[PDB]
Design a protein around this ligand. Structure first.
Ligand SMILES: *[C@@H]1O[C@H](CO)[C@@H](O)[C@H](O)[C@H]1NC(C)=O
Ligand SMILES: *[C@@H]1O[C@H](CO)[C@@H](O)[C@H](O)[C@H]1NC(C)=O
Ligand SMILES: [Ca+2]
Ligand SMILES: [Ca+2]
Ligand SMILES: [Ca+2]
Ligand SMILES: [Ca+2]
Lengths: 275, 397, 397, 132, 397, 132
């Protein structure tokens, strides 16, 4: 009940001033998420200590900087937990991972509200353009079968899963969209992969996705028409992971200046599970 | 003070009508008025000034009268006329400056500047010539109070205030909604805006409203209402509500559909004009209520479609504006104008001699806080100094 | 009606010149006028009102003359005069109010308001005192048919009108060319835009022209001409001509090169100014032709070059513009202004008592529809009611 | 008043004319540039329009006071009236409007045109000095 | 109205001084006043009533003059005088009851009630006797423009408000911090509360401020300031901000430290009182700013320590309060009090006779809604009806 | 003024109107419920529709009284005025239409036009008293 109904009256001439304070932590925390390729190429192990020591001169006290190491992009896509305050995610671009990188970017860069989907019992729809179905697990093979108004599968027989239509096969993460307003019968390997009916709230701005490799390929917005260039959708050019980390450390003030510590959540999950 | 105004008026008429060669028939009545002024000011010792840097001056009057039997005035006559008129003009100038600088909280209408009180005595009522001017006539009609009125061209009734209200906001200020406005002089300029272009409003229509409370009700105001407020139709970077950060505003303007303006006097709807720009009229009002709407355009050519997306970024922000200018008006209580130099004259005489700050007026006669807080003491004391300035400007200008 | 003005003038003079202590020399001729007025008006019964909510009232005059034996006016004189004067002022106020609410499709200038019609009779022709104000002077001249002239400050000769024309159009509205204009009050803001920035135009010069017709021929008008029409110099989303879709307008303000304004009377060149901004003068005119040119700049820094390509998209849309204020003018027929409160007075008096829509005037008496169709009958009625309102404002404010 | 002043001046005396919105200023639209180069990618200076009774003056900086001392860039514009006014009422507002939308402006020499893409910041610690 | 007050005055003086056995020296002047009042009123004819259930009544005066041929008044004289006086008193009672019920949004000061309007004429100016009472003296000092003043005991200036703000809130309503206030009549009682007793506030001190803006400026007000706002010093169950739920409030009183009450006029500070209690004086003011502070005690007995934890429960809720009484005041305008009965009399007349709800006053003369919006027309009408009510109460109780 | 002043229902021949600014002729076309074979073949239920059913109304205004002045079939006032203008080739004036064609003069019959028309018609009457 933060009184989010009355307007706030400002003034257009007074003044440029300072932000007072906030007492829930001594200071914010910066938080790198890098792939194991970085460590293997660096071939070190005091290097986290050295990077912390170098952030210290940039002006981050010791306990504030944390490092996280995911196996690779697909293995990070499953339940991407951002246990932290200013998250940077170094995504090494590789050919054929364009859609998966886009999936992960659309997942973390935006604020999702997810409900459960009991696939075995009910059919499902999509309320609007902001409603996706997000499936995660060790392997998802989401076979959908759209039904007409009479609960008769069109282009598929509800009793024969072989005729169902595979929108995404064997993915660690799948943000599947289907035509809005049509019931669907879903089928996916419930032992390994789970699925959720997720609506998209506004954007999440703890997270900065740094594409380390190729050209601008991230398309967070599922709309084909729009392809916005968010300020947090960073793109750096690389030959060596030391150079990458040094650039991040050197320019970290701008990295956090383009983000906001405010849009943080209690739980570290990438969505609000609303049952 | 009627005596003061009549003194100034008869000196003006003496300087004008008493000219070489004119018929005595043209100026006989003014001659008798001038003689009355001379004989009823003779022997009276006045003192003026003594506040701030304003010097203390003594005026002693012993002047000759003006002949009557002549049929045509000549230079031998106008020379005496000017020799007296210069001294008298100086006297009224000093008296007016004295009364302008003086001030009070209790019984502001009454005359300060003890010279003016002495004039207000009963001996000097024989000078009262005729109270013709707008300000003196309003003064008399107010003194024996009937309803009266001052007519102003472009009255600076609003206090200078530029501000904004944010109905929707978040600590990154990327998707806002609200109303910017600037009330300055006789201009209102109010601009509502949606960063989402009314994407999720009911029926894709967003309502904007803005209430402006005049400190004094205006009468028979001619007003000009136009769309597309211009001061809020270019990119800006605006300090936050409290100065924490600064948020970017990138307007793209649509027309305000179904605009309406209601002119209110003590609550009730005195006038209401719907979707009617150009010149309008408010017969009597104390509050203005501008209510307009931003409607998402249902049909979008591809350029504007690219401008307004369903997604979150919102690189451009829809705006709908209104300008409302009080071209002329009639008010019970005195106000500054673009047509009359009363406020300028009083403030100039105060600043010239560095009068210490008094009880009621703001420091430096700042019009903004002199119209923001306009209590009756402020109002009637302001009327007194303004009418004295009106008297002075008849001669010293 | 001349007698009505004489009544108002003599009451104003009585209220201003019959004051305590004023000599009888100052007011002898006024007393003679007042006594004549009393003698003429005694033993008459006027009836005022009966239209809309304006209440019927009956006026009966039995007032004694004013004394003449007093050398210098005293109190009791003033109270006797005032108890007469408030009654007379109320009568004149009601007469003017009842006259301002009546129209006549045929013979507008002739009086309405049976009270005023009775005043027009031969009995009351001995009240004719003085015809000094501008409006009564022009009324007398019209009855004495010859040239009439009303001097105006910011005359709102232009009916409100915002609109555009497209000389090159596509259903996608991506490569447009044409003009937009706001004519409002004394403002003409015109802006010619070209989306291609004159690629294929002859010599990269695109000619823009705008024709404005005045409903009355203004005379000796000072006009402020500036470049860069502001209102059409920022991004905008404009409904198409038929309202089907909306197109996007993204200005880049080039200089208007070799501008040329012609002021024309009966379609012949009366005044011409090329590349001459600032204060100009139109001697006597009835239409304004504003012709300017969008000239593509041959030399460009890379920023400008990137703005204006030779290709298809045209993200930024070149434009030029002119602003033309009529600061003051002289017209042969009565108009609203930003200085006089006559339109406000008449409209307020109509709205106060809810006069039903009359034969001649538009509903609510809105100046845009009144001036856009300003037929001679409407001009007659407007002059009559404006003169009456100017008469009323002498006493009532 | 005109014959008043005629007489008062013909017989040397102090006098005056009251004007509503006098056009004391000659028409002048111009600019000065304190930082420049032939590319016109990085400029700093002032644009101004003196017109009738208006002075609309807009300082501008392409770097938004990046390398300026203390992130503050000072702008000053002096305008010298041909004849001194007296007891004037003036209206001062922010946001010089005519220089708050995109423009293409010839250079001082007129050789090439440069693009000007304003973003209206708020002028701070403004000062107005009336001199005689 | 001066005539009406003089009529009531002389009737009261007749009823009080024309008693059996008085000298004629006692009542000579009064008998002359009464006799010429009889002469003035004889031959006239008034009508009263006609609005609501107030019955119409026609008053015709034809009375004999009171004798003057006695030495000591006897019972015959007194009986005849009473036969006259009872009728005249009934007439005055009806005139005042007719004048009280009538309103006019336009020109509220002027007389409604055609009976009193006729009394305002020139024939009845000779009845004027003396204007001694406070209300009529202020009426005269406003008839001419001079500073009036009404002395009030416990003035009902504050409109009835009883409400809170929560500067910290959440749905469970378990940790709150804010202010409650009751403004009523002459009382302000404001109590700031904090559930955490200022744990995490800067320097263990929580600031509270309460601004109350009088609708009219008081003068020479005697005020009584005490700590410990009574009404917010016990358990309560209060509806939520929107009424969706209710929240428990369990005060424990702390002494408000560095309390500071400020009386302000037109923004600027007039009087300051820091850590002052008992009776104080506000010289002249328009708003009151009551600031105080909840300071967590540094040293704390184990009992109070148990009262205030650092954890979440907060079973007892710290509060600091102020009480602020206006014992007396002087006001330019007119207000109801705990002493005068004029508001009660006017409201009683309207309720008695079922007057329809008029334009200006609210229904039932509801004082809270009357003082909330106290426009100048409403104030004018209120002063008129109040002085009429006092005139009535001179004779009728 | 949009107020039904007279109403005649299925009444032909001569009728009267007290005072009227507008005439509303309403009628109907009823398919004949019974039909001789000739008319039946004339009107088929198919598409072609080779003969088209119609229903008409004629309305002469035999005489009237008008507050304003009009031309007539009985009065030579308009003819006199127009002939006098044509015989001497008067330049087209600011109020009357070119040639004084009655159709365009009564299509727009503003009060100024009515005033001038009444004046010239009365002068024509005065002249026609003598010069026929
Ligand atoms: C705001 O922060 C700046 C940072 O350099 C500091 O210099 C300034 O003093 C701060 N404000 C105040 C009021 O101290
Ligand atoms: C998915 O399809 C397989 C057959 O390929 C079936 O065995 C399984 O039960 C289906 N999953 C669900 C949740 O019905
Ligand atoms: Ca299939
Ligand atoms: Ca995937
Ligand atoms: Ca979808
Ligand atoms: Ca996309």
């Amino acid at each position: 009940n933060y009184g989010l109904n009355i307007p706030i009256t400002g003034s257009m001439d007074t003044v440029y001033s300072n932000s007072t304070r906030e007492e829930v932590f001594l200071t914010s925390t910066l938080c790198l998420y890098y792939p194991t390729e970085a460590s293997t190429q660096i071939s070190d192990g005091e290097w986290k200590d050295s990077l912390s020591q170098m952030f210290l001169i940039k002006g981050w006290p010791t306990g504030s900087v944390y490092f996280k190491e995911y196996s690779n992009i697909v293995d990070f896509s499953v339940d991407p937990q951002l246990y932290c305050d200013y998250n940077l995610v170094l995504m090494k671009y590789d050919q054929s991972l364009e859609l998966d990188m886009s999936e992960l970017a659309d997942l973390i860069l935006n604020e999702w509200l997810c409900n459960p989907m009991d696939i075995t019992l009910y059919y499902y729809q999509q309320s609007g353009e902001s409603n996706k179905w997000i499936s995660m697990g060790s392997s998802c093979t989401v076979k959908v079968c759209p039904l007409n108004t009479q609960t008769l599968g069109i282009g598929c027989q509800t009793t024969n899963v072989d005729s169902f239509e595979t929108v995404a096969e064997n993915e660690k993460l799948a943000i599947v969209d289907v035509v809005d307003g049509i019931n669907h019968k879903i089928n996916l390997t419930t032992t390994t992969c789970t699925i959720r009916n997720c609506k998209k709230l506004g954007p999440r701005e703890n997270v900065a996705v740094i594409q380390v490799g190729g050209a601008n390929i991230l398309d967070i917005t599922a709309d084909p028409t729009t392809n916005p260039q968010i300020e947090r959708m960073m793109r750096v050019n690389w030959k060596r992971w030391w150079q990458v980390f040094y650039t991040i450390v050197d320019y970290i003030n701008q990295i956090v200046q383009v983000m906001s510590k405010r849009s943080r959540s209690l739980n570290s999950a990438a969505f609000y599970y609303r049952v | 003070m009627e005596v003061l105004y009549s003194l100034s008026k008869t000196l003006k008429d003496a300087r004008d009508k008493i000219v070489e060669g004119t018929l005595y028939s043209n100026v006989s009545d003014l001659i008798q008025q001038f003689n009355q002024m001379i004989v009823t000011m003779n022997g009276n010792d006045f003192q003026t000034g003594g506040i701030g840097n304003l010097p203390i001056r003594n005026w002693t009057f012993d002047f000759g009268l003006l002949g009557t039997t002549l049929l045509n005035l000549d230079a031998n006559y106008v020379e005496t006329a000017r020799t007296t008129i210069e001294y008298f003009i100086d006297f009224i100038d000093n008296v007016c400056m004295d009364e302008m600088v003086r001030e009070s909280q209790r019984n502001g209408v009454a005359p300060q500047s003890e010279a003016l009180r002495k004039l207000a005595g009963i001996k000097f009522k024989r000078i009262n010539f005729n109270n013709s001017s707008e300000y003196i006539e309003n003064w008399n009609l107010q003194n024996r109070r009937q309803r009266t009125g001052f007519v102003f061209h472009k009255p600076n009734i609003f206090p200078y205030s530029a501000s904004f209200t944010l109905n929707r906001s978040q600590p990154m200020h990327d998707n806002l909604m609200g109303t910017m406005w600037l009330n300055a002089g006789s201009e209102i300029q109010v601009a509502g805006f949606d960063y989402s272009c009314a994407l999720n409003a009911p029926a894709n229509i967003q309502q904007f409203e803005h209430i402006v409370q005049l400190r004094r009700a205006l009468t028979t105001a001619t007003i000009t209402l136009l769309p597309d407020a211009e001061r809020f139709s270019f990119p800006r970077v605006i300090n936050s509500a409290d100065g924490a950060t600064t948020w970017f505003f990138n307007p793209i303007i649509l027309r305000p559909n179904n605009v309406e303006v209601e002119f209110l006097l003590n609550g009730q709807i005195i006038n209401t004009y719907q979707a009617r720009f150009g010149t309008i009229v408010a017969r009597n009002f104390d509050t203005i209520r501008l209510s307009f709407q931003l409607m998402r355009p249902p049909n979008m050519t591809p350029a504007v479609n690219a401008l307004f997306p369903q997604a979150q970024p919102f690189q451009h922000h829809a705006t709908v504006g209104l300008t409302l200018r009080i071209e002329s008006a009639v008010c019970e209580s005195v106000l500054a104008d673009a047509n009359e130099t009363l406020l300028a004259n009083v403030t100039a005489v105060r600043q010239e001699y560095a009068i210490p700050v008094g009880p009621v007026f703001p420091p430096g006669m700042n019009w903004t806080e002199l119209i923001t807080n306009y209590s009756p003491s402020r109002e009637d004391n302001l009327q007194r100094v303004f009418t004295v300035a009106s008297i002075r400007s008849m001669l010293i200008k």
